[PDB]
Design a protein around this ligand. Structure first.
Ligand SMILES: [Cl-]
Lengths: 124, 127
């Protein structure tokens, strides 16, 4: 089973986005695959470092999404993060404008709520 | 990877405990291994009706504990459950009495905080 973590870092009502180095290379949430021997947290911290060069700490686990029909089975965990050698592609997008970046027709309010939505789950 | 789900169904400040058909028996939380192809949810619902015969729905993810160093790697998810629509060994124990059944004060506080502690996480590695 594969596991992926993504971080949501909010400051002044904006979310941190990075340019994806794969696919259509759109601005998306920072994250990556959890590597063998890594706790979800170590992976999150490593991914933030490699894609934004920032040092962070887990604030809370917000939303977990699992799709076992994937190949291989996939578990997706999203963390609320707080801030504490290539130049990184980074952008702070106002939460309002997130819809202009193609963000899900099912959420955006999920992150608007912040801690209020901690622990959300889906299963599909 | 081995994934385990645990259910915490609270009603009137009491937690649902089940009696283990293994080891020294003893009252513990309902849960089990997530079987291949199941979503965490499908497994939670399945374990819940095999051990308590109740129909439940997930409220929120309460706690995620992962031990990548375990053999095999372990991910343990705890769900706050809510009731919806063979005889099982079931008991509703008041939360302020869980210490009697071996639960630590730390855990009792977690369950006690309820929805307020939703989304808790902890990574555990040896050394
Ligand atoms: Cl690897």
């Amino acid at each position: 089973m594969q596991v992926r973590v993504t971080g949501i870092l909010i400051e002044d009502e904006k979310v941190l986005l990075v340019k994806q180095k794969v696919a259509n290379r759109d601005w998306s949430l920072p994250g990556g695959r959890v590597e063998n021997g890594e706790t979800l947290e170590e992976a999150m911290i490593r991914e933030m470092r490699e894609e934004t060069g920032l040092e962070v700490k887990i604030k809370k686990l917000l939303y977990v999404c699992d799709k076992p029909d994937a190949s291989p089975s996939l578990l997706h965990i999203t963390f609320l993060l707080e801030r504490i050698n290539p130049i990184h592609d980074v952008q702070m997008v106002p939460i309002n404008e997130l819809s202009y970046y193609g963000f899900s027709e099912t959420f955006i309010n999920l992150i608007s709520g912040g801690l209020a939505n901690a622990g959300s789950y889906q299963g599909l």
